[PDB]
Every structure is written in C-alpha cells, then in structure tokens.
Design a protein around this ligand. Sequence first.
Ligand SMILES: NC(=O)c1ccc[n+]([C@@H]2O[C@H](COP(=O)([O-])OP(=O)(O)OC[C@H]3O[C@@H](n4cnc5c(N)ncnc54)[C@H](O)[C@@H]3O)[C@@H](O)[C@H]2O)c1
Ligand SMILES: NC(=O)c1ccc[n+]([C@@H]2O[C@H](COP(=O)([O-])OP(=O)(O)OC[C@H]3O[C@@H](n4cnc5c(N)ncnc54)[C@H](O)[C@@H]3O)[C@@H](O)[C@H]2O)c1
Ligand SMILES: [Ca+2]
Ligand SMILES: [Ca+2]
Ligand SMILES: [Cl-]
Ligand SMILES: [Cl-]
Lengths: 354, 354
Amino acid sequence: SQPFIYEAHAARVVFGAGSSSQVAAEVERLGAKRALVLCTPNQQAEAERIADLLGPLSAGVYAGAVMHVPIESARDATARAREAGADCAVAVGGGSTTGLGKAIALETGMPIVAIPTTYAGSEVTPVYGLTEAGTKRTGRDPRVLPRTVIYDPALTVGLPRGLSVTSALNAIAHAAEGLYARDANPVMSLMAEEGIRALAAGIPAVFNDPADLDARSQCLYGAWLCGTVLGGVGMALHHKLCHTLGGSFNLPHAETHTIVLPHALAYNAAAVPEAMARIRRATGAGEQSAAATLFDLAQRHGAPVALRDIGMREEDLDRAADIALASPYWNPRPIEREPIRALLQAAYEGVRPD
Amino acid sequence: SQPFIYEAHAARVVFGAGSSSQVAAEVERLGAKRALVLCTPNQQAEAERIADLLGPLSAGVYAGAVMHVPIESARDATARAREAGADCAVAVGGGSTTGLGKAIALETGMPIVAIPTTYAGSEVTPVYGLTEAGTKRTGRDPRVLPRTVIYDPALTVGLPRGLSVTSALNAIAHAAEGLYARDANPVMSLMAEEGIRALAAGIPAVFNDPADLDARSQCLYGAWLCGTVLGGVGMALHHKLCHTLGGSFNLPHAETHTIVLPHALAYNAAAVPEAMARIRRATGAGEQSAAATLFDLAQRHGAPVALRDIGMREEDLDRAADIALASPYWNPRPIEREPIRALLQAAYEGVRPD
Ligand SMILES: NC(=O)c1ccc[n+]([C@@H]2O[C@H](COP(=O)([O-])OP(=O)(O)OC[C@H]3O[C@@H](n4cnc5c(N)ncnc54)[C@H](O)[C@@H]3O)[C@@H](O)[C@H]2O)c1
Ligand SMILES: NC(=O)c1ccc[n+]([C@@H]2O[C@H](COP(=O)([O-])OP(=O)(O)OC[C@H]3O[C@@H](n4cnc5c(N)ncnc54)[C@H](O)[C@@H]3O)[C@@H](O)[C@H]2O)c1
Ligand SMILES: [Ca+2]
Ligand SMILES: [Ca+2]
Ligand SMILES: [Cl-]
Ligand SMILES: [Cl-]
C-alpha cells in the first residue's frame, strides 16, 4: 500500500493466429497510403508476404535491419523511406527490426506498425537505440512507440528452438526487474507476474512442439505483458549488465539475458524478498529460489547457461566488472566491485545458483 | 487462445493517501491556468479544500452536480466555467460529479481532472449521460475521458456505511460482466479478477472500520480496475437491466446494481462457466455459486437485496421485463421474456440464488 503514479501509453494490439492478414486494414486505419516494410535479410520471405498483403499500399521492402541499429543503417533506411514517399513503416521481425522502425520514426515522425516475431518486447516501449562508433546510445521518445502491434503466433512458429527459449527469458527479465523497480506499481506488477507465468508455461510447451499455435500464443502474450512492464517502470542491475556485456563485448543479446538473469537475481535477492516470492510463484519454484528456477528453465530446454559458451573471454571479466561500476544507477542492493566481479565469474562458468 | 484487439487509452493515475494535495501540480501539468472545482451540494467542504489547494489556479467551486446529470445542471455549470474563464474542470465526488465534468468536457473540450470519492468507476470510461425531460440518454466519446485521475482514499473515509457496500458491488458488477464480454481479452480479465479480489476483501474491512486507509485504498484500487474493465469491454444483461430499472423506474443506482447482480449472474451462469469460476475464485466462493456468494456479500454487509426495499412496485415488473426485451443486444445466454421476468421476480423479493 505505497503511493504511485501509473501511466499507460496509448496502445492498439491485434492478437491471434492469422492476425498478420489484417495488416492492410491497420495501415488504412492510420490513414497511411505508402507503407515501407522492414526486415533483416533473413526475414525477407515474411516481409514479402506482408508486402503482398499490403498490395498497392506497399512502398516496398527494405531488408537491411541489423542488430543494435547501426546509425548508418538508420540513415540508409530513412533515406529509402523518404525516396519511396513512405508515410508508414511496418516492422516485421524481432527487436532489431522494430528498432530500425523506431529510428525511422525518430527522424520522420511516421507511424510504425510492429509485427513482432520474437519475445524482445520492444514494440511496446518508447525506448530507441542507435549504435555509433561501436557504442549503443539509447533514448526515450513517445514518437518511437509503435501505434499498432500485430501479434501473430503463426509468424513465431519458425522462431528457432534456441532463440524461442532465450528471447523468452529476455522477456521474463523485464518482468522480474519490473517487480522490484524503484517506481514499481500494482498494475505493472500484476502484468509482470502474469507475463512470467505465461512464459514459464509456454517455454516447455513450445520446446515440446514449436508448431503448437496455443503455446506460441501464450509466449507472445507473455512477451507483450513483459514488454509493457519494460515500457512503464525502471529496470536495474540485470538490464544494465546485459547492456554492458552486449555493448562492450559483442555478446549475443537474448542469450546474455538468459545467462545473466539468475545471477543478477541472486545478487539482488536479499534486498527484495517480496519480488522474489512473486517470481517464484509465477515460475512454479515451490521452495526453490527464483534464481535456481530460472536457471533450470534455461538449462532444461537447451539454452546456454555460461557466458563461456556464447563468446565471452574469461580474460575480459575484470574489465567487465570495471565497466559495470562506471555509470551509477539505482538498484535495490549497492553495486560494488567484488560482488559484481563474483556475479560475473558465476555467469561465466554457468554455476547453478543455490 | 481466441483472437482479440486490445485498445487502451493513454492514462495518468496518481494513487495514494494524500494524493489530492498534489492537485495544483496535476493541473499545471496539463497546461491549465484556471480550474473550476465541481461537486454536489453534499460535498462542498471537500471541494473547498481542493479549491484552496489550487490557490491561484482556482476558478472557484460550482456545487450543483446532480444524480444522472440533468441537462440544465450541465448547461449551468458550463456557463459558470465559461464566465469564470476556466480552462480545466476538477471533478471531486462520485459518478454524478464525474458526469457533470464529462458533460462540460463534451461541450467545450477542456480537460478534466477526476478526484473520485466513490467506487462507480466513471472516471475511467468514455461513457457520458444526460437527463432531459426526465429521461437519461447515454453516449460514448473519448473527449469525456479525464486526462488525470487522483485517487485519495482519505476522501472516501466519510463515504457512508451503506453506499460503501453498494458502490463496491456496482464496481464488482463491471468486472464480473467484463469476464464474459463478447470482446473479453486476457488483460481486461486479469484486471477484472484483480478488481473483484480487492473489493471482495475490502468490503468487510471497510465495514469493520471506515477510517482504515488501507481498507479504503484496497476498495479504490479495485474500483479503478473495475472501471477500466467497464471502459474497455462490452457489458451485457446486468448493466442493461440496471439501466432500465434506474432509468425507467427511478431506482437508486448503486442499490439497483447490488440487488440485480446475483440474478443476472444466475441467468448467465450456465453459458459462461469459466467466467463464473474466476468470479468464484476472486470472491472466495469455494463450492458456492458466484450468484449466491455475491448475494451474501451484499446481505451480510447490510445492503438491500430486494428491489421492493428500494421502491420498485411489483406491478411494474411486467413493464420492466418488456423494456428489458425491447432491443436485442448480445448476451451469452439469449434474452427471453419468461426467464427475464422470473429474474425480476427473484430480484424484486430478494430470493437468494442457489
Ligand atoms: N528498445 C527496447 O525497448 C528493446 C527491448 C528489447 C530488445 N531490444 C533490442 O532488440 C535487439 C534484440 O532483438 P531480438 O532478441 O528480438 O533479436 P533480433 O531482432 O536481433 O533477431 C535475431 C535474429 O533472429 C531472426 N528472427 C527473428 N524472429 C524470427 C522468427 N520468428 N523466425 C525466424 N527468424 C527470426 C532475425 O531475423 C535475426 O536474424 C537488441 O538490439 C536489443 O537491444 C530493444
Ligand atoms: N459513465 C459511467 O461509466 C458510469 C459508471 C458508473 C456510474 N455512473 C453514474 O454515476 C451516478 C452514480 O454514481 P455514484 O454511485 O458514485 O453516486 P453519486 O455520485 O450519485 O453519490 C451519491 C451521494 O453520495 C455522496 N458522496 C459520494 N462520495 C462521498 C464520500 N466520499 N463521502 C461522503 N459522501 C459522498 C455524493 O455527494 C452524493 O450525494 C449515476 O448517474 C450513474 O449512472 C456512470
Ligand atoms: Ca584459461
Ligand atoms: Ca579493475
Ligand atoms: Cl529467491
Ligand atoms: Cl457459479
């Protein structure tokens, strides 16, 4: 019963198997006449189906989305949008594709329709990212928040078995830290816990059958709730450290989240037992720790659990601990060198937390 | 997982004991320079405290709000606003005061800051009502949605023992029908169930001590969630029938919802077992039906459970049934005269549902 200020962003979310077939209707609803479809080179097939659904509303497909939105990709995409007379951007892909859409919207003001194909949750946050001279700069601007999100679990069926797990833990991370945010509120916490519950149940169902559209729906729904928590309350240690590892050492995004989460939770656990108890309840932990339970959820379904396995040099951990301590931020427990360095060593080695 | 389209209004909600002290900042935040405070003649003391907190931002207090927003109060209030040069209205009170505020916003476009003191939930719906030539017509329009809502449980301490119960059941009714709405969605249902849970626990706590600020927070929190469901999904038999009874027979509002809800639930129960299971879970029903449990929640806490106790004439029941069947609207179980008339007989006499 502590006071709070709740803010909800305007949102329009179209959800269900086959929903991507209504893409033209959603562009028309925005009053847009020339929508540019965005994707990575690996998702051109999906992008083409979207472009075909748009028919004469299509401004073409720009298939150069790239991880962490290099500022020169943002420029190139925006140039193409301008050249096509685009008045709308339709992002078909994961966090990186949404991110290119966000960059175009940042420079042009045009609406974005997001069609997410991972569990990253970027489609519902006002946070954008640009990588310049190797370092990712992020900011917040309502302008980058997609006007409409179309969640179609059919587009996640082919999400590979690995990323389906690791992106799912990335989403759980948003919710886990949301529960202990300095600006936590009951509504965000309600959605946080439900999001964790949905993903915790969906990971094994999807792992057993990646073509199960109900299991896929349950994960996408969880991803939406998690992303909503990310967009509404402040993150802390886990997200900051993942940014450090990803940005300073080029570690793959979802996998870094997956490996770090249990150790970031172990670090903060003593400080926020109420949030931990909610994470445990939502993950079916029983008497187990939140940390151990999330570790097992990753491990049991084939995700890597050691930074060693995703390209982190053991010899860079000392530097990683220094960078983790460089730019201060609020966290429930103080960020100190030694225990951060020990968190990093345990994450490196893939030690199951107690 | 069945498909849906979730739309959400931008929202700002300041919640907690003492939040009404922030009213001046909330008005400046909207860019307004002259807020007219609105209330019923019974709540002028609280309006004055608000007008004083507004200091130089105060355009004064209009103390003429009335049940079901008579069109003349509406026009008079607007005049006062207009002659004050007000660019903002602060509604301090229950649904009737929020209503006047909605009426002024409908006409002039000015922002409303809602400071609710009952559990009706109007503060978060786009529905407005006007009474003209003794008959109340409603409509919907985003323009009537308050830009900011300030929930201060200290302003509900003096909500009388009777209305505290009946208003709370009016709130529960919104969540209950929201759980079986044709356009039900998982987020609205998550809030619906949470709303019912808060109010089911809060009613007896408030009954035990009306000055208990935690009990009062719990109720107001529940009211907000239930109001949000009321504004996001379609209601059915319960709300339609209450509008008929209140409108055509001039029955007291909160009392009518309270009396009708168990019987509208009993009518629908067999069509929507899953929604009934969530209602039973949220109300601690155990093996009892939702209908019986909500009847008991009213009765145990001294609310009326028979329309006869609030002035309905038994000879008018046939006409109420006629009006209840006047136009076909969607409801999970088909609306048919014989079982509707029997529902009315049961509500009229206060027969506890099985
Ligand atoms: N701004 C924010 O609020 C926010 C939030 C979360 C993530 N992000 C950012 O998003 C990026 C991470 O995004 P991500 O983890 O979604 O991965 P990604 O967008 O970088 O996708 C990784 C690869 O998977 C492929 N892929 C994605 N969905 C697929 C599908 N369903 N079927 C087949 N292949 C598919 C993509 O084409 C890509 O090649 C990072 O840059 C991260 O920082 C930003
Ligand atoms: N538009 C919508 O979505 C919607 C939803 C619910 C109700 N309503 C409308 O609201 C009206 C009824 O609302 P209501 O049930 O809030 O009652 P009310 O607003 O009519 O209040 C009843 C009486 O109780 C007093 N009161 C209210 N709060 C008090 C407090 N905290 N302490 C002491 N006295 C207090 C009021 O001054 C008034 O005299 C109806 O006209 C109904 O249709 C509209
Ligand atoms: Ca070595
Ligand atoms: Ca060092
Ligand atoms: Cl724990
Ligand atoms: Cl039941």
